[PDB]
Amino acid sequence: MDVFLMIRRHKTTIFTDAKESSTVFELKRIVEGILKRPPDEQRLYKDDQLLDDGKTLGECGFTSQTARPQAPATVGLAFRADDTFEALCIEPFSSPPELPDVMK
Amino acid sequence: MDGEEKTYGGCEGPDAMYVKLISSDGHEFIVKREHALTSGTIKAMLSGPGQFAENETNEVNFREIPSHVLSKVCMYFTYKVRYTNSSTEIPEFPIAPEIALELLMAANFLDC
Amino acid sequence: DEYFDWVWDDLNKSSATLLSCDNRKVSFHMEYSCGTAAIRGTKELGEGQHFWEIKMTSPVYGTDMMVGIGTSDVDLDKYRHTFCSLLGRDEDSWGLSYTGLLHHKGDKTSFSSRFGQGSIIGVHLDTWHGTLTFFKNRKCIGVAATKLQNKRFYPMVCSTAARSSMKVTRSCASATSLQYLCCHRLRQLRPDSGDTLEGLPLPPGLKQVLHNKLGWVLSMS
Amino acid sequence: GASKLRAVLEKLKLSRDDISTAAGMVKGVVDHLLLRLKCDSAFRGVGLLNTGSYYEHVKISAPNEFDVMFKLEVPRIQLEEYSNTRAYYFVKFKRNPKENPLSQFLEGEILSASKMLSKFRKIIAEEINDIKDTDVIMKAKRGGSPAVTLLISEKISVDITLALESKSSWPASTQEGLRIQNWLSAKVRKQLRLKPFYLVPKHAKEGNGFQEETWRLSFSHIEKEILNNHGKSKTCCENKEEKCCRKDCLKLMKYLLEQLKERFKDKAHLDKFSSYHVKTAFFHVCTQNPQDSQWDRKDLGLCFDNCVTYFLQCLRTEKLENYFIPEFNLFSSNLIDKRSKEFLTKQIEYERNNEFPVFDEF
Ligand SMILES: [Zn+2]
């Protein structure tokens, strides 16, 4: 059964609908199918913690519960900086405008 | 399902299944072919000459759309493509009201 | 007003009613009234969004006069010779009575206050989320039904007063879009004011088209 | 369409005066009967229950069929139920010193209403011939309680009924009835709860025969009293601005029920319904809605419809509880057939949905 998730790295912010029994290596395979980056070069994280390629998203804390239709859970993605962890190249989103009082 | 082959790994030419969308602030969101064809402007522009070639870069840049608006557009697109004609109960689409006050201009700017 | 989108079915009506004014006005029992009489709409509501309100013109009386929705599985002339509520009798139909009570699946739920001659009743339908909303005298009453997905419906009216009629004045339809959902959200965030355009510099043309599409939403809370 | 209701109201109103014009004849006849009874020993204490209003009228469109009810006070008695009916009672004389109104009707241990009425008829026949300025004819029986029928000349007809009276406290079977506390406050309830009650004679009948000697409680005087003092306060309808339409909605329904019976008199299937059922339903309705603000002169429409809707629902559910005996079911299948019940439901709904076609012939 498919679960609504989303994977983000630097500029990239990509939704995914892989099945729950899939593996993290399967997420790397999907990313390879999308942007030709090989699974070995890729690295996946949750929040800011290391993860194993062989583990499944079910045991990585990502399930249908995290797959809310209004907010699929975010999965950290990283591309190997030559041979090491790349820096925090994430760029914050634009500030939202302030709501006026008469809508408050 | 795993290890999709498609005999070439894709159809990135006349049947481009992934297209690339860049926002004004740099945020990047990928959409499947029917997601792109859902918006009238995207499907109209993709029909231009030369765009059916294999080597054409399936890239669209929205210099007027920020990150949040494009994210909500992709959200709505995924919702409508997945639960179109849904047999099961269709879930609501709740966005925080301090962040979704501007989405009106997205409809007429992007023709979606 | 913008042209109405459906009429009362010429081929599908009970054995006791006459229609008039390009079918905009339907008249019930001009003589004996010895049973229930009923009609359906022509257009199906299974796709997109829909909205319409009906204006009354004759004094109200009799057993029950009701406005509601139902499927095509219900028969019209089964009560040709009996006084009964046809709408809401089964799970396949719904109905709001003028007495301020609602019929569904053969049970009764009080919903609102009574109304009669000269009253205007409005119905809002959202098939995509499968929810149904009723309006009265350009005011909001409340939501009545939900979880109606994958079902197909026709609009029905049933009557039992003689010397009486009902008259559809406006009928329009629209597709699901940001001009639907985002403006509903905005009205939920702006319920206090009667008008919502205030403080919005958006072009007058899109303003007028959004009136013709969802005027009640900008004028109801 | 309150215009038709107001028009028929005025049309019924315009014939009010003709009653008092002919009332003198019946007044004289009943006066002569009263003196004749008073010279007799059997009924030395018979009086008039409505002095100043000495006639009772049951039909709203029959100015020639009068009704009169004689009261007969009884000092001290004991009553008991019959086969648990809770509406029919026997009577006994328990203990008294040497003072016997008339014990010769006592058979076994029950005062005999049969002998009562038997001597009552004989006195009337031996007396009636004494009148010489007006031709009067006495007509055959029509029921247990109206055992005497008096016809004056050709036009005026009167049926005379008799009832007992006793000052003793009301029995426990009516403890839960008359829920007026919210309507007219408990103080009036308590004071009317010690006024006397009346026992009228009414035979009991069954499949294997009829049991003649049985009585029944009556509350006509109290029933009239509340309607006469219907207002929540003493000032209701005492000025031209505050008038309330509680009274008219009952005479309207009597007329409808009489008209339906007249139009369907051939098959006689609707001859088992009287005005008692109409009055009980209206009393239940006004108990349900005691506030005076619901009976303003302007509308009349929601109140008449509430009356007819209440009667229709009672008829469908086969439930109708007496206003003083809360357990008595007049609409039970023991007395009224389901065939006639559904017949009347069909007719009443047809009239309601056709906007009362019978009133147009007037
Ligand atoms: Zn009054």
Residue C133 in any domain: the answer is: yes
Residues C32, C16: Cα–Cα separation, whole Å = 10
Token representation of residue D258: 């009489």
Which of D263, D261, D166, D269 minimizes the C-alpha distance to D218?
Answer: D166
Based on the fold, state whether residues C144 and C183 are members of the same structural domain: no
Residues C113 and C212 in one domain: no
Identify whether C111 is part of a domain.
Answer: yes
Residues C83 and C134 in one domain: yes
Measured torsion, CA atoms of residues B106, B110, C1, C3, in degrees rounded to the nearest 10: -140
> Are D2 and C117 contacting, i.e. CB atoms less than 8 angstroms apart?
no
Distance separating alpha carbons of residues C54 and C158, to the nearest angstrom = 13
CA of D240 to the centre of ligand 1 (A): 11
CATH of the domain at D123: 3.30.460.90
In sequence order, what DSSP letters do the residues of C113-147 get, joined into one string? ----TT-EEEEEEETTTTEEEEEETTEEEEEEE--
The residue among D345, D354, D360 with the most chain C CBs within 10 A of its CB, best to mutate, is: D354
Burial tier of C28 (Cβ tally within 10 Å: 0-12, 13-18, 19+): buried
Give the nearest partner residue to C129 out of B87, B92, B104, using CB atoms: B92
Q: Based on the domain organization, do D212 and D297 belong to the same domain?
A: no
Residue D352: its chain C contacts at CB < 8 A? 61-63
Instruction: Note whether C43 and C90 are same-domain residues.
Output: yes
- Check whether residue C133 and residue C210 sit in a common domain: no
Examine the domain organization and report whether C136 and C108 are in the same domain: yes
Looking at the structure, do residues D26 and D135 belong to the same domain, yes or no?
yes
Asked whether residue D214 falls in the same domain as residue D234, the answer is: no
d(CA D39, CA D330) in angstroms, rounded, equals 40
Calpha distance D61→D94 (Å, rounded): 45
- Of D314, C186, C197, which is closest to residue A103 (Cα–Cα)? C186
Is residue C96 within 8 A of residue C68, CB to CB? The reply is yes
What CATH number labels B17-112?
A: 3.30.710.10
Answer for the pair C212, C2: CB distance below 8 angstroms, yes or no.
yes
- Residue to mutate among B68, B69, B90, B92, with most C CBs inside 10 A, is B90
Token output for D162: 């008799």
Are D20 and D138 part of one and the same domain? yes
Strand partners, D198: D165, D218
Domain boundaries, chain B: 17-112
> Within 10 A of D165 (CB to CB), how many other CB atoms are there?
18
Same domain, yes or no, for D158 and D22? yes
In-domain check, residue C83: yes
For residues A4 and D321, what is the distance between their CA atoms, to the nearest angstrom? 65
Q: For residues D7 and C209, what is the distance between their CA atoms, to the nearest angstrom?
A: 53
Between CA C139 and CA C147, with CA C145 as vertex, the angle to 5 degrees is 140
Is C93 inside a domain boundary? yes
Residue D186 placed within a domain: no
* D67 in a labelled binding site: yes
Q: Report the number of distinct structural domains present in chain C.
A: 2
Residues of A with a Cβ under 8 Å from any B Cβ are 4, 11-15, 17, 19, 22, 26, 29, 33-34, 69-70, 91, 93-94, 96-97, 99, 103
Q: Radius of gyration of chain C from Cα atoms?
A: 18
Q: Where are the beta strands (DSSP E) in chain C?
A: 8-13, 17-20, 25-28, 37-41, 49-56, 66-70, 94-97, 101-104, 107-110, 120-126, 131-136, 139-145, 154-159, 164-174
Domain count, chain D: 2
Q: Any CB–CB contact under 8 A between B78 and chain A?
A: yes
Q: Residue D87: which of D175, D219, D215 has the closest Cα? A: D215
Does C121 reside within a domain?
A: yes
Is C220 in the same domain as C125? no
Contact D341, D315 (CB under 8 A): yes
Q: Is the C-alpha dihedral spanning C40, C161, C170, C115 positive or negative?
A: negative
Optimal mutation site among B1, B2, B5, B35, interface A, most CBs of chain A within 10 A: B2
- In a shared domain, residues C141 and C203: no
Strand partners, D215: D89, D201
Domain limits at D357? 230-362
Determine the distance separating the centroid of ligand 1 and the alpha carbon of D293, expressed in angstroms: 10
Please, which residues bridge with residue C40 across strands? C156
Q: Is residue C1 part of a domain?
A: no
Instruction: Assess if residue D104 is contained within a domain.
Output: yes
Do C37 and C130 lie in one domain? The reply is yes
Resolution in A: 3.5
Domain co-membership, D69 together with D212: yes
Same-domain pairing of C98 and C201: no
| DSSP code string of D309-357 | HHHHHHHHHT--B-SSSTT-BTTSTTTS-HHHHHHHHHHHHHHHHTT-G
B83 to chain A, minimum CA–CA distance in Å? Answer: 10
Cβ–Cβ of C190/A100 closer than 8 Å? no
Distance CA D319, CA A99 (A): 62
How far does C36 lie from chain D, in Å, by closest CA? 10
CATH number, domain containing residue D302:
1.10.1410.40
Distance from the Cα of residue D323 to its chain's centroid? 13
Q: CATH number of the domain that C157 lies in?
A: 2.60.120.920
Residues C80 and C162 occupy one common structural domain: yes
Domain housing C186: 177-221
DSSP secondary structure letter of residue D192: H
Cross-chain residue pair B107–C177, CB shorter than 8 Å: yes
| Structural domains for chain A | 1-102 (3.10.20.90)
CA dihedral angle for residue D322, residue D327, residue D331, residue D334, rounded to 10 degrees: -130
Euclidean distance between CA atoms D44 and D185, whole angstroms: 39
The DSSP-derived string for B31-100 is EEHHHHHHSHHHHHHTTSTTTTSTTS--EEE-TT--HHHHHHHHHHHHHHHHSTT-SSPPP-----TTT-
User: Do C133 and C75 reside in the same domain of the chain?
Assistant: yes
Q: What residues have CB less than 8 Å from A23, skipping those under 6 apart? A: A53, A54, A55, A56, A57
The Cα–Cα gap between A62 and A70 comes to: 15
